[PDB]
Amino acid sequence: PGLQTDCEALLSRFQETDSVRFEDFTELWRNMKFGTIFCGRMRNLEKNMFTKEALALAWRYFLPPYTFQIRVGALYLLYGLYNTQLCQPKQKIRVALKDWDEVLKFQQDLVNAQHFDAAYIFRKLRLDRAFHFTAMPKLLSYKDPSDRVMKLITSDVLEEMLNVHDHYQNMKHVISVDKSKPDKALSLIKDDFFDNIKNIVLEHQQWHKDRKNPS
Amino acid sequence: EDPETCLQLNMVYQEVIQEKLAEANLLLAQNREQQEELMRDLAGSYMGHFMKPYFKDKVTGVGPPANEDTREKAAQGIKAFEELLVTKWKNWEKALLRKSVVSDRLQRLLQPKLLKLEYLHQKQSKVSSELERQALEKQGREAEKEIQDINQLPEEALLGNRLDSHDWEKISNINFEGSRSAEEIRKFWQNSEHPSINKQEWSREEEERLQAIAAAHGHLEWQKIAEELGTSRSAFQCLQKFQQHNKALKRKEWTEEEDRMLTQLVQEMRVGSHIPYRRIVYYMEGRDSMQLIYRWTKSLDPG
Amino acid sequence: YQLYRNTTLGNSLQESLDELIQSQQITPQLALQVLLQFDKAINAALAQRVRNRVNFRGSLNTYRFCDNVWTFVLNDVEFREVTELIKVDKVKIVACD
Amino acid sequence: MLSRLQELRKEEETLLRLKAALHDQLNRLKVEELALQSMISSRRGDEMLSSH
Amino acid sequence: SGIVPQLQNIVSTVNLGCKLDLKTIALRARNAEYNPKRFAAVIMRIREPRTTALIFSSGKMVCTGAKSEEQSRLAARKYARVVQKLGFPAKFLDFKIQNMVGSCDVKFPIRLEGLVLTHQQFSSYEPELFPGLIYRMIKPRIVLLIFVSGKVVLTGAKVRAEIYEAFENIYPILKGFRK
Amino acid sequence: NFPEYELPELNTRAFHVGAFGELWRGRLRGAGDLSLREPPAADSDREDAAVARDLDCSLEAAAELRAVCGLDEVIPENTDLVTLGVRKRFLEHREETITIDRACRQETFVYEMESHAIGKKPENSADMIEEGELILSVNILYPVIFHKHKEHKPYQTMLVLGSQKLTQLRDSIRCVSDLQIGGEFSNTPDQAPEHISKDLYKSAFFYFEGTFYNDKRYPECRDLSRTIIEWSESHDRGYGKFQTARMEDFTFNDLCIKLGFPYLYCHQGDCEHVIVITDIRLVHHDDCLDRTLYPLLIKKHWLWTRKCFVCKMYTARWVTNNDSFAPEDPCFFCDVCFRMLHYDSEGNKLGEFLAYPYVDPGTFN
Amino acid sequence: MMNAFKEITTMADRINLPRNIVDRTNNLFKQVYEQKSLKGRANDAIASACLYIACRQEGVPRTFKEICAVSRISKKEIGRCFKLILKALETSVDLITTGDFMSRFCSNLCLPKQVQMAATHIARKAVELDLVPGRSPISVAAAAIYMASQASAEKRTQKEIGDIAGVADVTIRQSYRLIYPRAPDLFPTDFKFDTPVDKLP
Amino acid sequence: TVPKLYRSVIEDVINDVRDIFLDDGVDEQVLMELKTLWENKLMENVVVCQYDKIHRSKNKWKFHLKDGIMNLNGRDYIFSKAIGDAEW
DNA sequence: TACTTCTGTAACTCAATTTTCGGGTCCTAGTACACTGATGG
DNA sequence: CCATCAGTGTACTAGGACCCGAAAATTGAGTTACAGAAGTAA
Ligand SMILES: [Zn+2]
Ligand SMILES: [Zn+2]
């Protein structure tokens, strides 16, 4: 009942700072008084149910296909929510087996990137034993996602491609027995590969922006 | 200088682009697996299909035959859950019962005379005589008069005397669509819903007479109590009224042994702050949940 | 209807009526009238006195249709009443409507 | 849930376009390699005219 | 191509040569059906050739469901023998195969719209009435039901060679309209 | 095997619980996370050193992280958010519409059942559960006692212990069908009560994904699944390749099942319950750590209790059919009314009726 | 020969179709009465078949269910007589396209012109992309109309579309699920709406 | 259940024919002894029934039977609806 | 009074259409049951 | 001061129509024989 809106607003206000430090998250927590989200008269049953829902939502936002900034913000959100609970038996974040690899590699990347704040937050969460290592995220009965284009093509990939291409042109210039002209048997190389991929990516982002722009 | 350098650079370029192609193809395979998951979501599908007949056919819809243990259990007269299922008698159900009984009696009283009239007509068809034909016509007129008399019979004389055998099983099928068994309908009609059972509100004089008769005659022969009460009442109604106005039904006074029993039962059947008093009552003799609630909240509470 | 005068009930009625005829205690016209009345009564009772569904599986050996009567002969048949099973080697089903 | 469906299908079309471009690149690379083999064979044929 | 149609049904007729009392056959046959209020023939079924025979009072029997000419002839002879055992002077005269229905799959989707556009004088494609294109082949008097799934059903032929030649004639057109 | 969605959000592919538990324990092997111990200036230095070694950072950096990342009720609530605003409006509405404002009996009952045994340490220290025991949050669907059970299915959820022999949950599932007393006591109600159905019919079996684990522990037990297997072996019923077991040489750790998929548990002839495994998780330190009582009833439906049709003060100790006094054919009486209505002076039944001992499902289940 | 032109005129009036179609239907009826290759068929059925043929020929085809609802015979006889007339007259009719039933279907409904164009484009692109192989054009038109209405401001349920187009809601669902995943690329690029095309039932 | 139905049928038939017995000139004692004889004498598998729908697939027969009395293994059973399947 | 069509049965094909079949779905209306809140002798 | 006895706040029932989707079944056309009844048409 509006909890998802609060979580999304907090994550957006964290990402707009373009920062990973826990100091910004703490400042946002104090300004928004998010620690009072659990405040309010509610008996133990509904209290723990709401805590379960909040932890599940935060963990869902912490996992892919969200961006790195959103994932780290959701990590701080999980830390703050779990550490600030009114339930005597603090509710635990449900962790599935299939998602353990993603979380472990995310932590490894965080520590590798010198983002010691998020790594220490995750380590504190693990040490406190705040995780219920279940089989599936939820009991079974009866945004800012991440795109694959950036994984496929980015600045470094195209830089390497064009470096290879220009080196290729140079060795073609030097291979021919005569310096005047290259051999007629090797002239099929395409110069529009970079242009073609640029066209594809610009069309993709144009579609994306005209999509997220309302009619 | 020599195209060998062209070969080396070229297959290393092919290797890098082939690694890129393999990664892209793995992404495509993952995307198509996601799409397959999504279509099976569209093609996916309850708890109700299992409840009592977990194993059931998809052509007949019947489960496996009852186990020999089930047959032995039925032999010992252990009522199943569906056999002990009780449902209240709705007002429309009562009216339907009345109408169905009236129609049943009309049909049962008409079929004999109608068949007699049909036989008389058949005899008239082949009589090969005239004076005998006129006599048969007179008999048919008498039969038709009897049929008319039966048709115009009043409801009071048509209902019966709450002890005559009607076709209660037909009512369970034609009139009722099967929601009530034949025996249930028979018992409800004979004991409770018959007009010969006084359903009017009890009077103070009637209640006093019932109490006096129960005291003098004993509280064990309620059939004779109802018969002697004068008014047309069922033994069940008399017993119900006596109990609802009785004063020895509950013990009305607490004892040390009863307090100890209540404390032991509460400590045994507690799950925390939830104390189900209804479940505690039935190990207590002649007690109600309100009495236990008051006793455990006011006196036997440790606090 | 000339269909239900073949079972145990209808047969026994037939021999009882015959026994009265040979005893000179009843006339054949009344006998046939009673037979027609029994047919009507049994039809009405079965259509209105009975509520229970059976399901039978078998390998239909033969069938036959004529003058509005089906005559199935099935082999290795199993009937399923409310809860019990009845297995028979061969069964004949005579249907008429 | 059509939002993620459309996002995924559009990514699918984009990555099929990338695969088409890369497959054309690979085909032309293989044609170039065949030309390389042919012309290197022809050129090396000029020095086995004097062998032991 | 290398694929050939597989016969699914063969309708043949024979003259038993004597009038029949359908009531007696219905009352004495093993698997006969006789409903004069629904049809004027006795419907008999047999298991070994898996065929259905309609027997008429005039003595003309129609056997259907056979998957081969020899099977159809054997089924017709079986029905003739069955009628003979019932006390009738039934013979086997004028046995003729009247229809041959076969099915096949060219194994590729077909564009029916283009086919009807370029073969308007033969094909009749009405999606409202039937989801399949009806091609009235002219060289052999055969009718082909052609579906977008590639399945082709040939009907109306009296000989197997007719079906084979009709499929050979139709296959190039379908290949040219390969969706 | 890895548990994955067989259905989008409804079911999981069949996997061995043993492999899943082994994977979980190997991915947390020696990580200091599976402890099962109660939570505990000198320790600050050790914590800083541990952070430094785990995160490849300096001691001063570890101290800075520890000090800066520290933790960061009161009835009034102001400057509300959208969800907090909704909660405030709901509280105001409840205050203005309610006069007592207390937890309802159902709420307290559910909470106490859920939290009946949390953090309860063993009295012996020898039944302590090992670090990682694959708790199964099973649920048993109640039988169709009242008619409305068909519409909405009530269930009782039990936290079964992994690597726990079967027949330990079967002996723990509390159902009224095991307390049924057979025979008819119309002639005299003072007969010695016949052995409860729990003793006469000890047979029972689980069915988990095409495998009938029959409870053949006792000599009185015999294969109930034999009838089902023979029924399936008949002409054709789709079901096939049925398996069999003994149910005492198998444990929940050795079971291959799905999550959220209805499996069967039959006992007392034909009393059938739907077994659904909501989820499987490793044992934590904030839940029960005992093994003597771990087959623990976490929730029960609190069924209704039948009342005597004569007096509405007591339950139904007897059920009468074909009664010449009752209005309804199946009529429910307590001992007092039944005795007063069905026996003249010494136990001679008055009229005609078939009386049976009735155990209230809402009292013993 | 009479009592058929009057019946044809009554059928045309029940549809409010123009007089040129009526004249073509009368010409076809006179022709088929001249060949008499289908003498055994009822005159009313021949008139209905001629009316359907004329409507199909002039470029405003109707559906067999839209002639059955007007005529006194069932769709089976209408189709049989249609085929018989096409065989006897030795003439042919161009195959119906999904865009022919767009204008009438969307005019019977209160959908705006923008939604009509959107549905027409969706259906044309869907048939071009082979998303509905071998399915009747009317079902595809109904599915396109449904998606266009659900995405647009004015929403219509499957029932109303089925009644207007004479297509069972089950057929609408079957033809809608085939084009369900490809909803956006079928829509016009410049299409305004209040309910996102990105989310639909 | 079958004995109850048989008894009810006997009672109905007797009640219906009592009028003919009275009219034609035979005493009701003959009726009573008829009832007693029928009841006393009441003490190949054949099913006599009525067909609601005999569906025939390629080889699968589906029988929908309105009502019937069957004589399986020398024991009489009654059904008000039969849904059976068979393979020829 | 002719002079037609229209039934079955067979057999594959496909889409469209209907049927129906178990279960759910939502909504109004009592129902149980621990607790409160005086209430009176 | 220990019993009373309406109210109270729920989930849990009770009927009461009512809907949603899936699976099976049907229809519909294509051939061709065959005999007899319907169904207009003249
Ligand atoms: Zn049980
Ligand atoms: Zn009582």
JSON list of C-alpha atoms in Angstrom, two decimals, chain A residues 1-3 5-6 22-23 26 29-30 32-34 36-46 48 50 79 83-84 86 89-90 92 94-98 100-101 107 111 116-117 119-121 123-124 126-136 138-142, chain F residues 2-3 5 9-12 20 23-24 27-28 31 33-35 37-39 47 50-51 54-57 65-66 68-75 77 79 81-84 86-87 91 94 102-103 107 110-111 118 137 259-260 276-282 284-286:
[
{"chain": "A", "resi": 1, "resn": "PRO", "atom": "CA", "xyz": [0.00, 0.00, 0.00]},
{"chain": "A", "resi": 2, "resn": "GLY", "atom": "CA", "xyz": [2.30, 2.73, -1.29]},
{"chain": "A", "resi": 3, "resn": "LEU", "atom": "CA", "xyz": [5.47, 1.11, 0.06]},
{"chain": "A", "resi": 5, "resn": "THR", "atom": "CA", "xyz": [6.29, 4.18, -4.27]},
{"chain": "A", "resi": 6, "resn": "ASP", "atom": "CA", "xyz": [8.39, 5.16, -1.24]},
{"chain": "A", "resi": 22, "resn": "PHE", "atom": "CA", "xyz": [26.83, 5.41, 2.18]},
{"chain": "A", "resi": 23, "resn": "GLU", "atom": "CA", "xyz": [27.04, 9.00, 3.44]},
{"chain": "A", "resi": 26, "resn": "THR", "atom": "CA", "xyz": [22.42, 8.20, 5.38]},
{"chain": "A", "resi": 29, "resn": "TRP", "atom": "CA", "xyz": [17.49, 8.53, 5.26]},
{"chain": "A", "resi": 30, "resn": "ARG", "atom": "CA", "xyz": [17.67, 11.32, 7.83]},
{"chain": "A", "resi": 32, "resn": "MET", "atom": "CA", "xyz": [13.19, 11.64, 4.42]},
{"chain": "A", "resi": 33, "resn": "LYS", "atom": "CA", "xyz": [12.89, 10.14, 7.92]},
{"chain": "A", "resi": 34, "resn": "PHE", "atom": "CA", "xyz": [12.66, 6.76, 6.21]},
{"chain": "A", "resi": 36, "resn": "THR", "atom": "CA", "xyz": [10.07, 6.13, 10.70]},
{"chain": "A", "resi": 37, "resn": "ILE", "atom": "CA", "xyz": [8.45, 4.07, 7.92]},
{"chain": "A", "resi": 38, "resn": "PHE", "atom": "CA", "xyz": [7.99, 1.30, 10.49]},
{"chain": "A", "resi": 39, "resn": "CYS", "atom": "CA", "xyz": [6.67, 3.78, 13.07]},
{"chain": "A", "resi": 40, "resn": "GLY", "atom": "CA", "xyz": [2.93, 3.66, 13.63]},
{"chain": "A", "resi": 41, "resn": "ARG", "atom": "CA", "xyz": [0.50, 1.60, 15.69]},
{"chain": "A", "resi": 42, "resn": "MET", "atom": "CA", "xyz": [0.35, -1.93, 14.29]},
{"chain": "A", "resi": 43, "resn": "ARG", "atom": "CA", "xyz": [0.20, -5.24, 16.14]},
{"chain": "A", "resi": 44, "resn": "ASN", "atom": "CA", "xyz": [2.96, -7.82, 15.84]},
{"chain": "A", "resi": 45, "resn": "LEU", "atom": "CA", "xyz": [1.29, -9.86, 13.09]},
{"chain": "A", "resi": 46, "resn": "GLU", "atom": "CA", "xyz": [0.75, -7.06, 10.57]},
{"chain": "A", "resi": 48, "resn": "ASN", "atom": "CA", "xyz": [6.08, -8.47, 10.78]},
{"chain": "A", "resi": 50, "resn": "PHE", "atom": "CA", "xyz": [4.86, -5.34, 6.54]},
{"chain": "A", "resi": 79, "resn": "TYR", "atom": "CA", "xyz": [20.70, -2.56, 5.47]},
{"chain": "A", "resi": 83, "resn": "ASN", "atom": "CA", "xyz": [18.74, -2.69, 11.16]},
{"chain": "A", "resi": 84, "resn": "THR", "atom": "CA", "xyz": [15.70, -0.50, 11.99]},
{"chain": "A", "resi": 86, "resn": "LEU", "atom": "CA", "xyz": [10.27, -2.86, 15.58]},
{"chain": "A", "resi": 89, "resn": "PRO", "atom": "CA", "xyz": [12.45, -11.44, 16.09]},
{"chain": "A", "resi": 90, "resn": "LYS", "atom": "CA", "xyz": [13.92, -9.31, 13.30]},
{"chain": "A", "resi": 92, "resn": "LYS", "atom": "CA", "xyz": [15.23, -11.91, 7.57]},
{"chain": "A", "resi": 94, "resn": "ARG", "atom": "CA", "xyz": [14.82, -14.26, 1.80]},
{"chain": "A", "resi": 95, "resn": "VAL", "atom": "CA", "xyz": [17.72, -15.29, -0.46]},
{"chain": "A", "resi": 96, "resn": "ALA", "atom": "CA", "xyz": [17.28, -17.86, -3.21]},
{"chain": "A", "resi": 97, "resn": "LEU", "atom": "CA", "xyz": [19.95, -20.26, -4.46]},
{"chain": "A", "resi": 98, "resn": "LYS", "atom": "CA", "xyz": [19.76, -19.18, -8.11]},
{"chain": "A", "resi": 100, "resn": "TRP", "atom": "CA", "xyz": [23.42, -16.36, -4.83]},
{"chain": "A", "resi": 101, "resn": "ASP", "atom": "CA", "xyz": [25.84, -16.31, -7.77]},
{"chain": "A", "resi": 107, "resn": "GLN", "atom": "CA", "xyz": [29.90, -8.08, -4.05]},
{"chain": "A", "resi": 111, "resn": "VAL", "atom": "CA", "xyz": [35.05, -4.66, -3.55]},
{"chain": "A", "resi": 116, "resn": "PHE", "atom": "CA", "xyz": [34.25, -0.44, 0.27]},
{"chain": "A", "resi": 117, "resn": "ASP", "atom": "CA", "xyz": [31.09, 1.15, 1.71]},
{"chain": "A", "resi": 119, "resn": "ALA", "atom": "CA", "xyz": [31.00, -4.20, 0.44]},
{"chain": "A", "resi": 120, "resn": "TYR", "atom": "CA", "xyz": [31.20, -3.50, 4.18]},
{"chain": "A", "resi": 121, "resn": "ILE", "atom": "CA", "xyz": [27.42, -3.06, 4.36]},
{"chain": "A", "resi": 123, "resn": "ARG", "atom": "CA", "xyz": [29.51, -8.04, 4.99]},
{"chain": "A", "resi": 124, "resn": "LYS", "atom": "CA", "xyz": [27.76, -6.61, 8.05]},
{"chain": "A", "resi": 126, "resn": "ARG", "atom": "CA", "xyz": [25.96, -11.41, 6.31]},
{"chain": "A", "resi": 127, "resn": "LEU", "atom": "CA", "xyz": [27.72, -11.43, 9.69]},
{"chain": "A", "resi": 128, "resn": "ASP", "atom": "CA", "xyz": [24.55, -10.42, 11.54]},
{"chain": "A", "resi": 129, "resn": "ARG", "atom": "CA", "xyz": [22.80, -13.42, 9.91]},
{"chain": "A", "resi": 130, "resn": "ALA", "atom": "CA", "xyz": [20.01, -11.37, 8.35]},
{"chain": "A", "resi": 131, "resn": "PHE", "atom": "CA", "xyz": [19.48, -13.80, 5.45]},
{"chain": "A", "resi": 132, "resn": "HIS", "atom": "CA", "xyz": [17.05, -16.72, 5.31]},
{"chain": "A", "resi": 133, "resn": "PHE", "atom": "CA", "xyz": [18.64, -18.98, 2.69]},
{"chain": "A", "resi": 134, "resn": "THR", "atom": "CA", "xyz": [15.41, -20.33, 1.25]},
{"chain": "A", "resi": 135, "resn": "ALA", "atom": "CA", "xyz": [14.86, -22.34, -1.94]},
{"chain": "A", "resi": 136, "resn": "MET", "atom": "CA", "xyz": [12.77, -19.72, -3.77]},
{"chain": "A", "resi": 138, "resn": "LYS", "atom": "CA", "xyz": [8.62, -16.38, -2.20]},
{"chain": "A", "resi": 139, "resn": "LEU", "atom": "CA", "xyz": [6.51, -19.13, -0.67]},
{"chain": "A", "resi": 140, "resn": "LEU", "atom": "CA", "xyz": [4.64, -21.11, -3.33]},
{"chain": "A", "resi": 141, "resn": "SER", "atom": "CA", "xyz": [1.05, -22.31, -2.89]},
{"chain": "A", "resi": 142, "resn": "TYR", "atom": "CA", "xyz": [-1.92, -23.44, -4.99]},
{"chain": "F", "resi": 2, "resn": "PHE", "atom": "CA", "xyz": [18.75, -25.89, -8.75]},
{"chain": "F", "resi": 3, "resn": "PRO", "atom": "CA", "xyz": [15.14, -24.97, -7.88]},
{"chain": "F", "resi": 5, "resn": "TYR", "atom": "CA", "xyz": [10.21, -21.88, -11.85]},
{"chain": "F", "resi": 9, "resn": "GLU", "atom": "CA", "xyz": [5.03, -17.95, -10.28]},
{"chain": "F", "resi": 10, "resn": "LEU", "atom": "CA", "xyz": [3.28, -21.17, -9.25]},
{"chain": "F", "resi": 11, "resn": "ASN", "atom": "CA", "xyz": [5.53, -24.23, -9.40]},
{"chain": "F", "resi": 12, "resn": "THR", "atom": "CA", "xyz": [9.14, -25.42, -9.46]},
{"chain": "F", "resi": 20, "resn": "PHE", "atom": "CA", "xyz": [19.93, -28.56, -2.90]},
{"chain": "F", "resi": 23, "resn": "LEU", "atom": "CA", "xyz": [24.80, -26.95, -2.60]},
{"chain": "F", "resi": 24, "resn": "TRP", "atom": "CA", "xyz": [23.68, -24.48, 0.06]},
{"chain": "F", "resi": 27, "resn": "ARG", "atom": "CA", "xyz": [28.41, -22.34, -0.83]},
{"chain": "F", "resi": 28, "resn": "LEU", "atom": "CA", "xyz": [28.38, -21.32, 2.86]},
{"chain": "F", "resi": 31, "resn": "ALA", "atom": "CA", "xyz": [32.03, -18.75, 5.96]},
{"chain": "F", "resi": 33, "resn": "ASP", "atom": "CA", "xyz": [27.35, -17.67, 8.55]},
{"chain": "F", "resi": 34, "resn": "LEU", "atom": "CA", "xyz": [25.68, -20.94, 9.64]},
{"chain": "F", "resi": 35, "resn": "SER", "atom": "CA", "xyz": [26.27, -20.57, 13.38]},
{"chain": "F", "resi": 37, "resn": "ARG", "atom": "CA", "xyz": [24.59, -19.31, 18.22]},
{"chain": "F", "resi": 38, "resn": "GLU", "atom": "CA", "xyz": [23.03, -16.49, 20.20]},
{"chain": "F", "resi": 39, "resn": "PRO", "atom": "CA", "xyz": [24.32, -13.01, 19.25]},
{"chain": "F", "resi": 47, "resn": "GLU", "atom": "CA", "xyz": [36.50, -6.46, 13.81]},
{"chain": "F", "resi": 50, "resn": "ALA", "atom": "CA", "xyz": [38.65, -8.79, 9.86]},
{"chain": "F", "resi": 51, "resn": "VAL", "atom": "CA", "xyz": [37.10, -6.05, 7.70]},
{"chain": "F", "resi": 54, "resn": "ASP", "atom": "CA", "xyz": [38.04, -9.38, 3.87]},
{"chain": "F", "resi": 55, "resn": "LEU", "atom": "CA", "xyz": [37.83, -6.11, 1.91]},
{"chain": "F", "resi": 56, "resn": "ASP", "atom": "CA", "xyz": [41.56, -5.59, 1.19]},
{"chain": "F", "resi": 57, "resn": "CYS", "atom": "CA", "xyz": [41.65, -2.21, 2.94]},
{"chain": "F", "resi": 65, "resn": "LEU", "atom": "CA", "xyz": [33.89, 2.16, 7.72]},
{"chain": "F", "resi": 66, "resn": "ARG", "atom": "CA", "xyz": [32.88, 0.70, 11.09]},
{"chain": "F", "resi": 68, "resn": "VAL", "atom": "CA", "xyz": [30.58, 5.77, 9.73]},
{"chain": "F", "resi": 69, "resn": "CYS", "atom": "CA", "xyz": [28.32, 2.83, 8.75]},
{"chain": "F", "resi": 70, "resn": "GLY", "atom": "CA", "xyz": [26.81, 2.51, 12.22]},
{"chain": "F", "resi": 71, "resn": "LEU", "atom": "CA", "xyz": [23.10, 2.09, 12.82]},
{"chain": "F", "resi": 72, "resn": "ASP", "atom": "CA", "xyz": [21.25, 5.19, 11.61]},
{"chain": "F", "resi": 73, "resn": "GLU", "atom": "CA", "xyz": [8.90, 3.22, 19.44]},
{"chain": "F", "resi": 74, "resn": "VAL", "atom": "CA", "xyz": [7.57, 6.79, 19.46]},
{"chain": "F", "resi": 75, "resn": "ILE", "atom": "CA", "xyz": [3.79, 7.02, 19.11]},
{"chain": "F", "resi": 77, "resn": "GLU", "atom": "CA", "xyz": [4.30, 10.35, 13.60]},
{"chain": "F", "resi": 79, "resn": "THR", "atom": "CA", "xyz": [6.05, 14.50, 8.13]},
{"chain": "F", "resi": 81, "resn": "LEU", "atom": "CA", "xyz": [5.23, 9.64, 3.52]},
{"chain": "F", "resi": 82, "resn": "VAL", "atom": "CA", "xyz": [2.63, 8.20, 1.15]},
{"chain": "F", "resi": 83, "resn": "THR", "atom": "CA", "xyz": [2.61, 4.81, 2.89]},
{"chain": "F", "resi": 84, "resn": "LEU", "atom": "CA", "xyz": [2.94, 6.44, 6.32]},
{"chain": "F", "resi": 86, "resn": "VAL", "atom": "CA", "xyz": [-2.07, 5.83, 4.39]},
{"chain": "F", "resi": 87, "resn": "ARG", "atom": "CA", "xyz": [-1.25, 4.20, 7.73]},
{"chain": "F", "resi": 91, "resn": "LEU", "atom": "CA", "xyz": [-5.39, 4.55, 12.18]},
{"chain": "F", "resi": 94, "resn": "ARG", "atom": "CA", "xyz": [-10.09, 2.85, 13.11]},
{"chain": "F", "resi": 102, "resn": "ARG", "atom": "CA", "xyz": [-7.65, -4.50, 20.58]},
{"chain": "F", "resi": 103, "resn": "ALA", "atom": "CA", "xyz": [-6.25, -7.49, 18.72]},
{"chain": "F", "resi": 107, "resn": "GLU", "atom": "CA", "xyz": [-5.11, -12.34, 15.10]},
{"chain": "F", "resi": 110, "resn": "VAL", "atom": "CA", "xyz": [-2.43, -16.79, 14.51]},
{"chain": "F", "resi": 111, "resn": "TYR", "atom": "CA", "xyz": [0.44, -14.77, 15.98]},
{"chain": "F", "resi": 118, "resn": "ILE", "atom": "CA", "xyz": [10.90, -19.26, 18.35]},
{"chain": "F", "resi": 137, "resn": "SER", "atom": "CA", "xyz": [7.54, -25.28, 5.55]},
{"chain": "F", "resi": 259, "resn": "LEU", "atom": "CA", "xyz": [7.47, -26.56, -4.43]},
{"chain": "F", "resi": 260, "resn": "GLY", "atom": "CA", "xyz": [3.88, -25.36, -4.41]},
{"chain": "F", "resi": 276, "resn": "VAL", "atom": "CA", "xyz": [2.17, -28.58, -0.36]},
{"chain": "F", "resi": 277, "resn": "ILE", "atom": "CA", "xyz": [5.79, -27.64, 0.33]},
{"chain": "F", "resi": 278, "resn": "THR", "atom": "CA", "xyz": [5.71, -23.84, 0.40]},
{"chain": "F", "resi": 279, "resn": "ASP", "atom": "CA", "xyz": [9.48, -23.38, 0.63]},
{"chain": "F", "resi": 280, "resn": "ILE", "atom": "CA", "xyz": [12.70, -25.00, 1.85]},
{"chain": "F", "resi": 281, "resn": "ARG", "atom": "CA", "xyz": [15.25, -23.02, 3.85]},
{"chain": "F", "resi": 282, "resn": "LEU", "atom": "CA", "xyz": [18.30, -23.61, 6.02]},
{"chain": "F", "resi": 284, "resn": "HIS", "atom": "CA", "xyz": [18.44, -20.03, 11.28]},
{"chain": "F", "resi": 285, "resn": "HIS", "atom": "CA", "xyz": [19.41, -19.07, 14.84]},
{"chain": "F", "resi": 286, "resn": "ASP", "atom": "CA", "xyz": [16.21, -17.12, 15.62]}
]
